[PDB]
Amino acid sequence: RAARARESVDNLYWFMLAAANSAPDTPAFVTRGVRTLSYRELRTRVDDFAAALAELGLDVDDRVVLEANVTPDAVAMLLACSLLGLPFIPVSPETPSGRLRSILDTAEPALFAQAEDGGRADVPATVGTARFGAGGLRVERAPRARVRHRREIVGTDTAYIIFTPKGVVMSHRSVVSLYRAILEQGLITPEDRIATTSPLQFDFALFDIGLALGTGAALVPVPREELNWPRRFLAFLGDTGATQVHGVPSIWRPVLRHEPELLAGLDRVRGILFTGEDFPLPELRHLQGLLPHARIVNGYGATESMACSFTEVPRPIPSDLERLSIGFPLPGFDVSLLDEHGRPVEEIGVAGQIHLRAPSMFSGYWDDPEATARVLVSDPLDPRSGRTVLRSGDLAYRGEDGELYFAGRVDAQVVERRLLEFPGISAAVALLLHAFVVVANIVAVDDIPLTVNGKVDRADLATR
Amino acid sequence: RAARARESVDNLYWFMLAAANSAPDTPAFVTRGVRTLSYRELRTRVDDFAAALAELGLDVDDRVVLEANVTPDAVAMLLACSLLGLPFIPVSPETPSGRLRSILDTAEPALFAQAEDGGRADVPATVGTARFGAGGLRVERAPRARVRHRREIVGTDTAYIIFTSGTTGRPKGVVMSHRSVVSLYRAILEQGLITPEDRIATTSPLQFDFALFDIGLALGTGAALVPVPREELNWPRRFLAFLGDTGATQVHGVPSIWRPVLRHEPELLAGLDRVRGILFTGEDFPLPELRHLQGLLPHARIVNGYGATESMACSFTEVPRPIPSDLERLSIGFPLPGFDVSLLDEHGRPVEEIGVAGQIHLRAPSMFSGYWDDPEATARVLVSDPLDPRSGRTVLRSGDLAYRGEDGELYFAGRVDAVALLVPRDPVLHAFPANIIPLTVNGKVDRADLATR
């Protein structure tokens, strides 16, 4: 009686668990005492969680809030939700009760699921509650009864919604389409062990989980506690055998400050990937210098396409490089640089708004058709087809070879990188005009404050 | 300097020519003296046409009107247009000059291409003109010079635009992405309807996506396409001789292709012991005519194909063998795996009651991008899913009514907005019931033509 996505249909369950068919006994997870979990045991876990979820009688398109960080149990849950066409809303357990309530009021999910050891209480009675562990999914309060209307699950069904409220809706066809494009460009192999640092509510964790499991590689989730302490973090990457380290630039700040020598001892790290914001070039030159046998990739993209471009940094980085390239869109992705009037910008070095044609496009903003119509727009180069493109809110310019350079947001123009030129300045935040700098008004500080997702907390700086 | 779609990107060129890599010397076409064309020779033809097209400096999304029927040359052209991200507008050569001008005014194509022997003259000077043959693509009048802005071709780029007249007299251009078409080709290749050993008799004009279905299904599989010329079709003897001499194993056509053959040559039709399959779509197959065709070819599986241009297709259901004599109407069955139908009432609420008619709302991976230059029409048809109105997920509001049986099978129950005609003012009920068949170019009942009596 529960709809299950068929093998022939774009769905996270089939995409991420292909390796259970082809290599059941290869490790899918490495966690902490270093233990592996097989693709086979991972799949059995997804299936058990799916059986328990199926019994609740949720229709396809019914929403499950998933409060957890990147764990084998949290990934088995989102894959079980995926199989049953139940869109997952990932929420980090470090989210204030206030912001979870706001998500629960807009999303109106049928079910809220957290870990057995998780400590969320005071979820309202309108929403069902459950708890997951390797033992199984245990229901505290059953969702209200309903009639199931959807017969079959399809590729355009919603896989996940990312809330910041702003809810980016993403189809299984869209996510899998990005996973395929980056598997094509050959960024990692089944032999790799991917250190992922992002919280689960940030699609960079969904990228890392999908990239890894889709390839047949092992995921190495780094808990936030291990991450906070430079020596704890490096010992974690060491003990788990990480070959690839994925994170926002900020994961490196403490280790470059307090433990440069020890970071130079990650003899097994073949790669580093970052996205989310500019990597300060001084910090980036230092990390490259200490790990010379590690490929470093600049990943550019937004939640509404999951991602867009992946560009290897020059090795070494030119010491008077003004800006890093965000390179070329993935095969099957295409960027126009349009001026204020939607006209192409064919002049090298002139900034225009990135308009993205992608096979990984979001379905829309949850319950916000007016916002959707401002962002997901008629292709200005083919306005009559009804083709839509992402109006990105990102400015960029091209070099002589057609490479892109991120030039900040349209909405932020009303200094950072000309302070990075000054000796001893390793990271600089300017906002509206104060400036805050890591060594009108200018305040030197120790570290920059971070959002939960690990970006420059500009709002927090604004208030001091 | 021209953009070419990459191998990894949903595109008709790579989808339809994969067999040139894996089986270059298997036949892709059988035509009439019975001659084959290999996947290898087909590809060489597409590649030559692509080199010639590339020289015209067309940008990705620039439109090429293709006036032709299903020929090896016409298919090589649409695959070369495909590779270069140039959307093809297929037009039947028996289209009045008046209707071609209407398409040319809306579509504002950069190029109009026809066969060497084709006889369209005085195409306007605003549009480039060319002619194709085995010899090559020859440009009479070159398209305007322009600046190429598109760097890369993507799966969501427009493969083809199908132009008919809407329910008003306004041009109706169904825009279809490469990702959308290839997605349907894959779903029907999955269901295993034909094999590389099959020879597909295709009857549709090129301007009807049933020809695009047949071309794609066949070439995508590695099978052989058997295009039936329109003249040979109209004369029943010539038609059956053609199916016989070409070794056709599958016959694709609207029901009307059978009317003449069942009238004048039933016993000759019974001679095609090589036909394993028949496929039809476009309208109801009259049961008497269908029982007659079944009777004459008892070793032929017959499939009921249901769908519209805006998803290319939807469902494929075997007609029962034999047809139980007490059948009210044929089942249009179950949507293809990865396709899904809701039956909604007038208020967008689900219809869970067996035998009650609702409007088909279709969730499909083969959805059209929109109606050419008609965003208001697009918003009436490509609508917010009434079962998930907040996601921004969209469904096809089909304009078809249907109902379900005991087992959840579908039955077509006609149009929401609606041979027995209802000519309006109470609508008077004529038939050809108060008082008591001409064909559209695509081979359907010309209801409009009967209405004028």
Ligand SMILES: Nc1ncnc2c1ncn2[C@@H]1O[C@H](COS(=O)(=O)NC(=O)C[C@H](N)c2cccc(Br)c2)[C@@H](O)[C@H]1O
């Ligand atoms: N590489 C850069 N240099 C500079 N500015 C960047 C870069 N990457 C982004 N950004 C900025 O961050 C915005 C986007 O924010 S987001 O929607 O929260 N998503 C993200 O941050 C992460 C994004 N989904 C993602 C996830 C996985 C892999 C990749 Br590859 C990308 C972009 O619009 C840019 O303004």
Ligand SMILES: Nc1ncnc2c1ncn2[C@@H]1O[C@H](COS(=O)(=O)NC(=O)C[C@H](N)c2cccc(Br)c2)[C@@H](O)[C@H]1O
């Ligand atoms: N099998 C039926 N029983 C009864 N009524 C049918 C059937 N198939 C359609 N129709 C009608 O024709 C309409 C649609 O018209 S259309 O856009 O010109 N497309 C078509 O005719 C053909 C359609 N693209 C197609 C092409 C190839 C294969 C298949 Br499988 C389907 C549908 O809305 C239906 O009303």
Ligand SMILES: [Ca+2]
């Ligand atoms: Ca254009």
Ligand SMILES: [Ca+2]
């Ligand atoms: Ca629903």
